């Protein structure tokens, strides 16, 4: 699609066999999702935004469907107030900003 | 332009006589920058992100050039780690997210 920005750019995602929704966020370097179970080994990380830092679990090579488009990459899990799709996955679906 | 997301989508911004850069951020409702030169009195506001909530300085009716395009609207000054152009101004310059 072509998504205008009068409201938050939220899309349906599928991760871990579950349908969720997430914000398409060109300001986020990495994808961060609310607490859930994912396969494989994780590594502890910190991410910082407005507000300060949070503790997250880093899982690698996770399959996610974004608005019907498959992407595979790193997913961070932790206490974000909203699920966020960052640039590491937006690049895999060929998302662009246009003006 | 049609901007890919392999690196941060930074663009030139001009406010008054000051040339700066800022992140085009579809995940930000509001535009927030770290400093503006001699901008006068502000109105207090709070905003929240990953991390928690911060006090910012709200300024209305600011004329800002964003990647060559003129916008007029609200700019927040506060402790943001990177200057961000949020949706309140992205809509004025006709930006859309595409995939
Ligand atoms: C501040 C940015 C450079 C970075 N952030 C992405 C950003 O889009 C967040 C994404 C976001 C969105 C909602 C809640 C928390 C975080 N937006 C945000 O803080 O916006 C603030 C200004 O406008 C307001 O509207 C939303 C909150 C306020 S972030 O969420 O801190 C972040 C940082 C690192 C990663 N990997 C993922 C996310
Ligand atoms: C996304 C979180 C689950 C990540 N964890 C953060 C941790 O502080 C959580 C933060 C936390 C807090 C509440 C709910 C989930 C996670 N605490 C926690 O798991 O506490 C456990 C012991 O008490 C039990 O009750 C709460 C969960 C259990 S962590 O994996 O230990 C970890 C630690 C350090 C870093 N940098 C990154 C990750
Ligand atoms: Cl530019
Ligand atoms: Cl002043």
Swiss-Prot record, chains A, B:
Active-site residues, Swiss-Prot/TrEMBL: 25
Coiled-coil segments: none
Domain Peptidase A2: 20-89
Start and end residues of each stretch annotated as Dimerization of protease: 1-5, 49-55, 88-99
Source organism, top-level taxon: Viruses
Chain's role: Aspartyl protease that mediates proteolytic cleavages of Gag and Gag-Pol polyproteins during or shortly after the release of the virion from the plasma membrane. Cleavages take place as an ordered, step-wise cascade to yield mature proteins. This process is called maturation. Displays maximal activity during the budding process just prior to particle release from the cell. Also cleaves Nef and Vif, probably concomitantly with viral structural proteins on maturation of virus particles. Hydrolyzes host EIF4GI and PABP1 in order to shut off the capped cellular mRNA translation.
Quaternary structure and interacting proteins, as annotated: Homodimer, whose active site consists of two apposed aspartic acid residues.
Protein name, UniProt field: Protease
Organism listed in the record: Human immunodeficiency virus type 1 group M subtype B (isolate BH10) (HIV-1)
Full protein segment contained here: 501 to 599 of 1447
């Amino acid at each position: 699609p072509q998504i205008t920005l009068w409201k938050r750019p939220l899309v349906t995602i599928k991760i871990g066999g579950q349908l969720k929704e997430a914000l398409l966020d060109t300001g986020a370097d990495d994808t961060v999702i609310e607490e859930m179970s994912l396969p494989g080994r994780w590594k502890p990380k910190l991410i910082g935004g407005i507000g300060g830092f949070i503790k997250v679990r880093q899982y690698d090579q996770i399959i996610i469907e974004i608005a019907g488009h498959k992407a595979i990459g790193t997913v961070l899990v932790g206490p974000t107030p909203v699920n966020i799709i960052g640039r590491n996955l937006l690049t895999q679906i060929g998302a662009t900003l246009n003006f």
